[PDB]
Every structure is written in C-alpha cells, then in structure tokens.
Symmetry: C3
Subunit: 274 residues, 3 copies
C-alpha cells in the first residue's frame, strides 16, 4: 500500500527526532493503520514467495516507529500496575469474538496488539510480541516466547521455555522463521534470522544463531543460517585443532522417521472443537 | 472407584466424537468428579507401590477427556482477557482456606484446577498444570513448569526455568517423576517419563529424555530413563567413533556428599511458619 | 546506619524463633525501614568500593528476616488469587510516579517491593526479586529473572529466559553481579556469586556457577568465579584424561570486537523519550 508505505519510509529516516509530542497526525495515523493490518493478518513482515522468504523492511520500520509515536499509559493489573505503550491484543475481545477467531488462550498467556494469531492455535502461558505471525494449529507451550516479527508456520509445536528471536534488541536485519510442521524441543533458542525448514525436529537445549555450526555428520557438510527440511538436530561439540577443548555445535543426526514422529506428534484432541 | 473408572474407560474409546455439546450428563459428571479428586490429592496419576511407580492410565484418560467435555469460557484478566476451558485452582480461595492448606503462592504463580499442591510448599511465579502432584516442602522457583500429571516428591527444589515434562502434547505413556529430596538445577528439563531417584542432584542445563545417555564415568555403565538415587549429574558429551565430533550426554560425576549438600540445601526459614 | 544495623544483627541471631506473632515492634519497624531504603536505591546489598565489590551481609540479613516478620496476605489477581508476604512494588504507582521514575514496565512484568529499578530501564515480562538492584539503561527481556539481591549494571541486556542467581534458596554467601555494559545471551544462567566483568558478552546457553571452568583457549588460563572484562564466552567441553568423555565448560573465545558489537547492541529508540 503506497499511500502508507511512503509516509512510513519518510518518517523512519527522522526516527531519532520523532517523539510522541512532535509527531504530525499523518505519520501517527499511518503507523497506527499499519499496526492494525498486522494485527489482523492482512499484512505480515515476511512472506514466502517463489520458495524464498522475503522480508518487507518497511513493515519492520513501522513496528519500530510505533515506539517513537506512542506514549506510555498506566495499565491496571490486579495486584500490580504496568506502564507501557503497546496495548494488549485481547483487552477488548468478548466471547463471540474469541468464539469466531477460534484459538485457545490459557492464563496468563499474553499477546501484544500487532501480532497475528491464527485459528486453531493454543497459547499456553507465553508471550507473543508485536509483528509476530502464528499460523494455524500451532501450540506455544509454557513460558515460550515468539519474538517481535517472528514467523511461525502451521502445526508447529514450540516446547516449554523455547525462545524464537525478535528483531528489536539487539536490532536484526531479518526475522526468525519456523516453517510448517516443525517441532522445537524444550529450552531451545532460534535467533538472528535463522530459518528452520519444514518438518524439522529440533531437540532440547539446542541454540541456533548465525554463528552456529550445523554439522551434518553424514555428509560432513556444515550449515549456517538454516536447518534443511526434515532434519533431526541435537546438541554436540566439534574438537579444536589440538583436541585441547571442544566448542558447542548443532548436529544433524538423521532425517525424520517413524520413530521420531512417535515422540513429537501434535495432539488434535486439544485443538478447536468444530 | 469402579463406578467412575467404568464410565471413564467407556468414554475414552469414543474420545474423538465427544464434544461439549453431544456429551451425556453421566460422562460429564464422572469426569468432573474425577478431576475434583485429583485436585484434592485423594487420587493421583501415579503412585509408588512396592518400590515401583505405577501409572493409573485411566486417571490420565480422565485428564484428556476433560478437554473434550468442557467448553471454553472468557476469563477476565485485568488488562487483558483469556479464553480457556480449565478453571484456575485458586479462584475461589479465601484467607481461611489458604491459611488451612498451608502453602505460599507468589504472584503471578498460576495453578490449574486438578493439580494437587501440598502443605508447606512455595510456588514462586511458575506454572503447575492439570493432574500434577506437588508434595510437601517443595519449592517451584521462577518460571519453572510442572507439566500435566507430573509427580514431584517432598522437599524438592525445582530451580528457575526448569521444566518437568507433561503427558498431553506430545502425548506420553507415563508421567515424569521426581522423587523426594532432589535438587534440579536451573534451566534443566526432565521429560518423557524419566524417573529421577531420590536425593539426586541435577546440575544446570541438563536435558534428560528417553534417548539421553546417562553415563556413569566410574562404572562405564550407561543408563536410560532414570537417574539412580543419590547421583550428581552434569552436562557432557561422548565422542563419535571417528572422534570427528561429539554428542550431548548427561554424566554421573559422583555421589552426593557434604560439599554438594552445601550448595543445594532447602531454606526452612522460607517455609510455613507453624 | 547503626541504629538500624544493630537491631538487625541482634534479631538475625534469633531468626528461627521469630514469627510474625512474637516479633517485637522494634525489630518489625527496623526491618521494614531497611526494606524501604533498598526499595528506593538509598541502600544496596553490594557495592563496588576501590575496584572491589563488597557485600553488606547485614542488608542480606534484613532481607531474610522480612520473611520471619511478615505474615501472608491474600492478593487478588483477576481470574485467580495469590497468598504471599512480600508486597508488589508497583501496586501503588500512578502515572505521575511512573512518569517521574522513568522506566517502562511491560505486562505482565512483576517486581517485588525492596528491589530498586533505575531510570531508563525496560522490563519486558520478567521477574525482579527483593533486594535486587537494576541500573540505568538495562533491559530485562522476556521470562528473564533477576534473583534476590542480585546487582545488574548500567546498559546491560539480559536476554530472554536468562537467570541471574539469588541468595535465598539455596542460601548464598554473596549476590551474583553483572557489571556495566554486559550482554547475557538467551537461556544462560549466572549464579553463586559469580562476577561478570564489564563489557563482557556471554553467548546463548552458557551456565556459570562456582564450579564452572572458564577456559581461556589463548592463555590456557582457567578461571573460576568471574568473567574477565571484555570477554566473549561460549559453551564448550573439556576432555577427560582418557578421552573417554568430556564435560561442560565455558570458553573465552576472544575479546569483544566490532563484529561482536554488531550483534549485541542496545536499541536507544526503545529507551525513555526525554
Ligand atoms: C530428538 C528426539 C525427539 C529423539 O528422536 P529419535 O528419532 O527418537 O532419536 P534417536 O533416539 O533415534 O537417536 C538418534 C541419534 O540421535 C541421538 N539423540 C536423539 N535425541 C538426543 C538428545 N536429546 N540428546 C542427545 N542425543 C540425542 C541418539 O544418541 C542417536 O545417536 P546415534 O545414532 O549416534 O547413537 C528427542 O531426543 C527429543 O528431543 N525429544 C523432545 C522432548 C521435548 O522437548 N519435549 C517437550 C516437553 S515440553
Ligand atoms: C553440581 C553442583 C551443585 C556442584 O556440586 P559439587 O558437588 O560441588 O561438584 P564439584 O564442584 O565437586 O565437581 C565435581 C565434578 O563435577 C564437575 N562439575 C560440577 N558441577 C559442574 C557444572 N555445573 N558444570 C560442569 N562441571 C561441573 C567438576 O568439574 C568436577 O569434575 P572433576 O571431578 O572431573 O574435576 C553445581 O555445579 C550446580 O549445579 N549448582 C546449581 C546451581 C543452580 O541451579 N542454582 C539455582 C539458581 S535458581
Ligand atoms: C557470541 C555471538 C554474539 C557471536 O559473536 P561473534 O563475535 O560474532 O563470534 P564469531 O562468530 O566471530 O565466532 C568467534 C568464535 O566463537 C564461536 N562462536 C561464536 N558464537 C558461538 C555460539 N553461539 N556457539 C558456538 N560457537 C560460537 C565461533 O565458532 C568462533 O570459533 P572459532 O574462532 O574457533 O572458529 C553469538 O554467538 C551470540 O551469542 N549471539 C546472541 C544471541 C541472543 O541471545 N540473542 C537474544 C535473543 S532474546
Ligand atoms: N529481544 C526482544 C526485545 C523486545 C523489546 C520490546 O518489545 C520492547 O522494548 O517493548 C525482541 O527483539 O523482540
Ligand atoms: N507439553 C504440555 C502441553 C500442555 C497443553 C495443555 O495443557 C492445553 O492444551 O491446555 C504438556 O504435555 O503438559
Ligand atoms: N532461588 C531464589 C529463591 C527465591 C525464593 C523466594 O523469594 C521466596 O521464598 O519468596 C532466590 O534465591 O532468589
């Protein structure tokens, strides 16, 4: 949408000098419009086109600017109080709306406005930050986090305490992406724009960033930045040249098979009852 | 209780076709009765008999069915709202009740109805899921999670960010069990029905599942599925056959001694003041 | 303050026999006074003097005694209820106060009374326990925890799911300290009085306690208890004598450089807008 993109790209250049007081109504209204569209899933920060994920840098820009244009407001918790500038997505939902949108939200799961949550998902107590997109069938297990602008595929299981990297701080070029049908094991973390290709199974306590060596013991091939579709990855180490010590790495031990599927399947009984 | 077990086992077979609308009052009432009993500690999903933990599969079945028989309801948070089908355990407690039950609940710790919490425990902000049982004296530290149906012994310390596996998704045969007097170090995870025997000390960042090799450096013995009573376990790796790389494992480095006890003791000053 | 320190040190000796009922008004009032001072930053549990961090053991004592002198009270959550004896820091703040104190508090972040939060910090949903001190510019990312009495420097970034050890349980001699300008990578844990010196970068999934070997591959020097200023630390292992297995350790791989700074910088656009 040019009328919106234009204003966004002009404002971004003046980011440092914009404040909630000096911002003109045009930039304010535009940024706000863009956040509502992300919130509804009409727009998304990254999308797959021709077998490639592309990032719309200007939607990322809008997310950033929202922090320069909005002022903080006291939010009343019950026993306590908060002071922040991004509204809560569900603050205004009624049963009819929850009923139509079709996902389950377990207290105290919290989602910021500007994040899209699809039908048939289950959010256990967890956090979904602004700009993120969580597709159909996915479960975000306890204390997991979906970082700003992150893209999560359909039928994905993000285990307890798992973290998917954001793009706000530290600042990142690209969002982190988890394709369809992946299983991410407990306490693992995927950051810095790494792409976990569809049907992959990441074991527990695996840490993937751009500097992480993803070693394929079968081919000897070492990857960086992505997990090839259908891999089973676990933690390991690679020895130094003198064998004096070893350093952490992720190892692709095999391709997903029946034995693997037996341990990571989604439970449909917990999904939306049509 | 046969009158209840019977109905449960009949219904479970039709699990996929049961919905909150078509379920008959008999199955509804039964499942509900069983959840109240788990909630009060009168029944428990697994129990130790003759030096063996046994799982009552039908109590697990009842837990599962509760998700087929109950409908979602809007739950009013303060700044936000939730939409789920399992009530909050403490929603109706008054001071007299908390005073009688004798445990401490630190905001925003949350527990689902159907989980048993014993006297003299302390829940820092954490999550205890349906069907779980948390025995006397235990502390569940910050952002720890006690998964569905998990069994936690007396005087156990579950450190910050620790996860004890559930049985709902992925679906599991048996609950995860932590016997009396264990210490589980920060950020560790214990899943898939592994049993951590009494008096064991699990260090930080240790990940135990059924596939994890638990290597005893002293005997060369490799365990699977359980941590022998009184072990001190830490993270390590075992080399591949070509020494080309190494893969994660848990190592039993020694048996708990005075030096160990010095670092993992429970603080009675924080327990219930009789 | 002698008038306060005296009462504190006398009472501490009788800790086990003090209860909320038998405690005399003098000890009660004193302990309470000391907690208010910690809350405001007028006093702090540890402080750096002459290039050395010193711990005021008696302020730690006061923190402990607060648990012997105060009784539990029901705290009304919205959907649920809690029962604890430490008030919520922000329960009484209004917009004017939040506006003057100058930090951002993202729901559902929670802080206990007795912890100091400085200007220009951002608390994503996280936990800050009693006695802690969080200095200017710092961000406490999602599900991170600042343990009791811990000291966090200025401009520090505590990543998602990071844990900084407390001193209450297990009981510790000294608080854990993170000096200015450090970056602590996701899911890492720093405990047992370890000191991370200024400008250091701790990677993801690094676990540091007093028993952790911090190996400097360049010098062959092995540290214990502290991370030398300006280090980049990552997870690794050191081989056993027979090469039969290896055990976890932290490795200092290099000194912070431009390439490192490129990945761990603070985003000023998210800080307080003056
Ligand atoms: C990866 C996983 C799914 C097992 O898959 P699997 O297909 O059964 O893997 P296998 O048991 O066949 O092992 C295949 C190889 O990988 C290794 N391996 C598998 N999982 C491993 C793990 N977690 N740690 C170390 N090694 C592991 C085996 O040692 C084996 O190596 P080898 O061929 O050299 O001997 C399992 O380890 C896992 O990650 N489970 C997830 C638990 C979880 O997070 N639950 C959520 C709770 S909220
Ligand atoms: C295990 C632990 C308790 C130390 O116990 P300990 O009995 O003092 O162990 P020691 O220091 O004697 O070490 C014994 C052996 O295990 C090793 N070791 C112990 N803890 C280790 C750890 N965390 N990482 C790596 N190695 C460890 C030592 O290297 C030593 O190996 P060696 O005999 O080959 O040289 C400690 O490491 C730990 O896990 N503390 C828990 C911290 C925590 O989670 N706190 C909660 C904050 S919420
Ligand atoms: C440490 C880090 C910042 C990279 O710093 P860097 O200066 O770019 O490090 P480099 O890529 O130059 O690597 C230097 C050495 O350390 C290694 N290394 C760096 N980070 C590593 C990691 N996470 N795991 C394993 N090895 C790592 C490299 O293998 C290399 O070893 P070599 O010299 O023997 O080949 C990055 O790994 C990291 O920790 N990012 C933090 C992500 C995070 O938690 N984000 C927050 C999300 S909430
Ligand atoms: N590492 C997180 C930081 C989020 C910070 C944030 O959302 C805020 O300041 O409100 C992210 O990049 O998503
Ligand atoms: N891994 C968790 C998943 C819990 C899901 C749940 O409780 C729900 O759908 O409400 C568990 O098996 O306990
Ligand atoms: N490991 C934590 C334990 C905190 C316990 C606590 O604060 C309480 O009992 O209220 C700490 O030592 O800070």
């Amino acid at each position: 949408m040019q009328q919106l993109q234009n204003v966004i790209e002009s404002a971004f250049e003046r980011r440092a000098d914009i404040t909630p007081a000096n911002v003109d109504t045009v930039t304010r209204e535009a940024v706000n419009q863009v956040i509502g569209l992300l919130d509804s899933g009409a727009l998304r920060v990254a999308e797959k086109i021709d077998g490639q994920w592309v990032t719309h840098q200007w939607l990322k820009k809008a997310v950033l600017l929202s922090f320069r244009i909005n002022d903080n407001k006291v939010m009343d918790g019950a026993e306590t109080r908060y002071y922040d500038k991004v509204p809560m997505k569900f603050a205004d939902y009624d049963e009819a709306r929850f009923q139509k949108e079709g996902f389950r939200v377990v207290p105290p799961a919290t989602v910021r406005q500007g994040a899209f949550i699809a039908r048939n998902t289950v959010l256990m107590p967890s956090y979904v930050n602004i700009g993120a997109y969580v597709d159909e069938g996915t479960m975000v297990d306890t204390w997991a986090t979906v970082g700003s602008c992150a893209q999560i595929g359909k039928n994905v299981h993000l285990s307890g305490g798992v973290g998917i990297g954001g793009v706000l701080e530290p600042l990142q070029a690209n969002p982190t992406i988890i394709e369809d049908n992946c299983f991410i094991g407990a306490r693992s973390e995927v950051v810095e724009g790494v792409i976990v290709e569809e049907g992959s199974v990441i074991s527990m306590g695996v840490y993937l960033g751009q500097s992480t060596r993803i070693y394929d013991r079968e081919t000897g091939e070492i990857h960086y930045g992505r997990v090839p579709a259908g891999s089973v990855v676990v933690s390991g180490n690679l020895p130094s040249k003198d064998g004096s010590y070893s350093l952490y790495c992720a190892v692709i031990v095999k391709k997903v098979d029946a034995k693997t599927r037996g341990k990571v399947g989604i439970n449909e009984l917990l999904r939306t009852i049509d």
